Amino acid sequence: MDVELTVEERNLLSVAYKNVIGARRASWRIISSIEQKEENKGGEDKLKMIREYRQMVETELKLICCDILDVLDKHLIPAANTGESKVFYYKMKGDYHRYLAEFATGNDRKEAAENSLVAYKAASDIAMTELPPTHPIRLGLALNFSVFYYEILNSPDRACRLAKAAFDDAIAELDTLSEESYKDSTLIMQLLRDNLTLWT
Amino acid sequence: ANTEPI
Numbered sequence: 001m002d003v004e005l006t007v008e009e010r011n012l013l014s015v016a017y018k019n020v021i022g023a024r025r026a027s028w029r030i031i032s033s034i035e036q037k038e039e040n041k042g043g044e045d046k047l048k049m050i051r052e053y054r055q056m057v058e059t060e061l062k063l064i065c066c067d068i069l070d071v072l073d074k075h076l077i078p079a080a081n082t083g084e085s086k087v088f089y090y091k092m093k094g095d096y097h098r099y100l101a102e103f104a105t106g107n108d109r110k111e112a113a114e115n116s117l118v119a120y121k122a123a124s125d126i127a128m129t130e131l132p133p134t135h136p137i138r139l140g141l142a143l144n145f146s147v148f149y150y151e152i153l154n155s156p157d158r159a160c161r162l163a164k165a166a167f168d169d170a171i172a173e174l175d176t177l178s179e180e181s182y183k184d185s186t187l188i189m190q191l192l193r194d195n196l197t198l199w200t
Numbered sequence: 201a202n203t204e205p206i
Contacts, residue, residue: 018206095203140204147203191202198201 002079010088017068021099024061028103031057058103065096072096083130084137090126091141093119094148101152113152120145133169134177139188142166143195156199163196 005013031054038047077089097116104112124145127138142162149159170189174182 015206022206144203147201151201188204191205195202 001075003075004079004081005076005085007084010085014092017064021061021064024057024064025099025102028054028057028061061103062100065100068096069093083126084135087123087127087131087137087141090119090123091137091144094123095144098144098148098152116148116152120148132173133166134173134182134185136185136188139166139170139185139192143188143192146192146195150195150199160196160199163192163199167192167196 031050035047035050035054038050072089072093077086077093080086080089094116097112097119101109101112101116120141123141127135127141131138143166146159146163146166149155149162153159167189170185177185
């Protein structure tokens with residue numbers, strides 16, 4: 001059955017889970033760099049210890065992500081009324097599938113990327129039709145989606161087009177946004193602008 | 201590649 005969350009509860013929980021995840025994701029990147037460095041450089045026991053560690057960390061990540069997605073699909077996005085919340089939960093679905101794809105293998109990688117792209121596209125359709133271009137949930141969607149493109153889908157072309165579009169729609173609407181509303185969004189815009197100038 | 205901040 002269903003569950004609805006106030007914006008502030010949503011943010012609390014989302015932050016908490018992202019804390020956990022990001023710890024585990026960065027650890028995974030580091031273990032892999034050590035793994036590749038040793039794997040190129042020989043070594044018996046040490047490579048075994050490192051591979052076993054990387055495996056254990058992948059296990060934890062997949063377990064957490066899969067649980068997150070099962071509550072999203074089972075309880076949250078069915079219950080979503082507002083358009084901001086629909087976009088929110090569909091973007092979360094994209095995020096956790098993308099983190100699945102970040103380390104996933106072969107067909108598991110392929111399934112994860114497909115599910116992520118479905119979810120981001122769903123978020124996008126709602127964000128277009130219900131959320132201002134300066135809305136932070138929309139700017140976050142744009143940023144994470146373009147990153148999805150560039151890193152996972154490896155379409156720099158499409159990532160950059162998405163990022164520029166979102167940036168400029170915002171910049172356009174900006175002269176017409178309040179004070180307490182605009183300081184709530186500058187930082188996502190600058191992140192999209194930074195990613196973009198990076199990608200050239 | 202910098203995704204949305206916590």
